[PDB]
Ligand binder design. Sequence first.
Ligand SMILES: [Zn+2]
Length: 469
Amino acid sequence: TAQYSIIPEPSRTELRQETAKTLQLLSDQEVPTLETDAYRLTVTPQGAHLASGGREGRIYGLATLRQLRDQLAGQPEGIPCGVITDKPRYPWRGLMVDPARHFIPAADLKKFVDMMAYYKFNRLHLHLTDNQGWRLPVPGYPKLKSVASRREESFGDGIPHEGMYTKQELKELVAYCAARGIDVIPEIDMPGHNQALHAAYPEFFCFPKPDMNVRTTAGNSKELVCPQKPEVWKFYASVFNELKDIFPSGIVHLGGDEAPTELWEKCPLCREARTRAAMKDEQEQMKAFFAKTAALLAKNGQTPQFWYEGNAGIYHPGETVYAWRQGQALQSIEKTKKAGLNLIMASSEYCYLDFPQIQGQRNWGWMKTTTLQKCYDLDPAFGKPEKEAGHIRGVHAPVWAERLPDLNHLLYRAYPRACAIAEAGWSPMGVRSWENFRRKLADHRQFILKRFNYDMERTQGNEPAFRWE
Ligand SMILES: [Zn+2]
């Protein structure tokens, strides 16, 4: 029987036993009888009718109409008539890109955004800073451009890699995303992930090293900013003010994953600061660091987000954290509920799209394989009902880019698993099935070829070649 191939699967589809050979939009109304994020699309032999509860629902309805037009373009016999009534399961449906590890030019970001909007993603998270590069310009700190935005090579390849966005480019990105229903979330990791910052501004750190260079390999850095130094707090105030100007979401992801604190332990300034504050250890110092940063953000009307660490203690009720450790999803759901935290599911078992998608593709000596079928197994609530897991805001898939040097590589690992993530964030469990998703994705190969000039076919051997190992 003839059906639609819309991804994500709509919450309700009622097909009729007639065929439509045109999708001309005959009516387009806003009505109070639909939620602001909801739409109803009626496909008739004469054309389509769209009703929506608000601008957001209208964006989604037009995205569904776009997919139906692609299907009809491939089906000259027509597509079924029917009524689609639709609204998302979760309000947060996100992808993260990592320009700190490999810079993503503006044009390439635009293509990435168009593709994620096709699948009704509504959050774009930018990992802007890390050991391997710093991509956010900050007035008054020119060495961020001249030093921190450049590295000499990647993994011994002898090829320099550099880049930094302009403020104007980032405001363009924000407007481009907004027009496509997407909010943009910056991430500035602190106090660690800061080898590039140290290369530019060694005076911000407990043990300044003028010979420090921007990192060209993966691994953990012990270089933490020294919370006793006034230049650090002036710098981060400047950072947060730039983010306030550029990013209207007002959300600032601070990282927050466990950092090595050996250098704080040894720092003569931090040692005496801990003694004055009767702090027992460097974890108490970390709690104080994040309380101070959260206060700076609050003075700005901004709110922090974190990669969840169950035993961190740096969170205040109402904040939002990301669940990411394998095997910890259900525990994190329970713990955040008890702690009054909101939770975004980014479990690396399902959502870390830097991992290879077919067994035998490059795993860089450590990555597990996450197939499309495994990815589609994701239920963000892990079996818990809406009344017990209402603090779960949605789903988020990071495409970490240590080993993804350009858009071609990035999209190879992001898609088609991002389509599965989109359906996990949008579609109620009652309309989800691997067999239906697999059928639709088969059709989407042609849809994406025609609309984006991009090939989503995946075989063990057709990943683009790498220069490393
Ligand atoms: Zn220190």
